[PDB]
Amino acid sequence: MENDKGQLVELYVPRKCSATNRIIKADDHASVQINVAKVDEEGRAIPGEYVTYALSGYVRSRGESDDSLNRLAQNDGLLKNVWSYSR
Amino acid sequence: MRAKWRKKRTRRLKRKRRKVRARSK
């Protein structure tokens, strides 16, 4: 989204679903962003160290936010085993 | 009205004019 002389034209930049690659728009009142704080030594989650996860409004309308939850959580290292891809 | 009665009306009316056309043969 630009023009002949470069520059970023057309205001406003919407988000996107990290589980469905489906853009997050404002008319969705059912999309939830997760804020998982990254803990280190002696615990301490840190007030500014979080991991964001995109789970759209349609995902909640079916209850599938739990499937890609284990999916998106397992590969980053917060879920020791638990879920299995190969089924 | 009931169209079952409208089909009984025309039924006898066609049969009536059928024997009247046979009076010319």
Partner: protein, 129 residues
């Protein structure tokens, strides 16, 4: 019966993105459907596929992302005359900057702009975006 095999593979794919699938499965697959999977893959619409080999027709499990929205077919196989390409872009293509109409030519299964450089023509397959 089973007439257009390409239209059936796209069938399971239409409702696949309507749910948010990360995978799909086609059947029974032909040579034509193979070169079309490479068309979307070539521009970055879908991902890579894996054709499972069996002693029948065949099956392909394509791993899709979420960039693809609508994948359809144009039945039957229509005759194009170079002028049909510049009219069909306004026949169903969402934009004038993006979108590809793939068809069948003698030199291979490609789109209108690639067939533009080589002035090639033949029949028609489907639409992509």
């Amino acid at each position: 019966t089973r007439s257009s095999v390409l239209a059936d593979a796209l069938n399971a794919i239409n409702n696949a993105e309507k749910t948010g699938k990360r995978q799909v499965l086609i059947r029974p697959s032909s040579k034509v459907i193979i070169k079309f999977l490479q068309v979307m893959q070539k521009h970055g619409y879908i991902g890579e596929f894996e054709y499972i080999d069996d002693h029948r027709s065949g099956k392909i499990v394509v791993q899709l992302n979420g960039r693809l929205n609508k994948c359809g077919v144009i039945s039957p196989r229509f005759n194009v005359k170079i002028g049909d390409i510049e009219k069909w872009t306004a026949n169903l293509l969402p934009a004038r900057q993006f979108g590809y109409v793939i068809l069948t030519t003698s030199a291979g299964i490609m789109d209108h702009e690639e067939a533009r450089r080589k002035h090639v023509s033949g029949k028609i397959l489907g639409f992509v975006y």
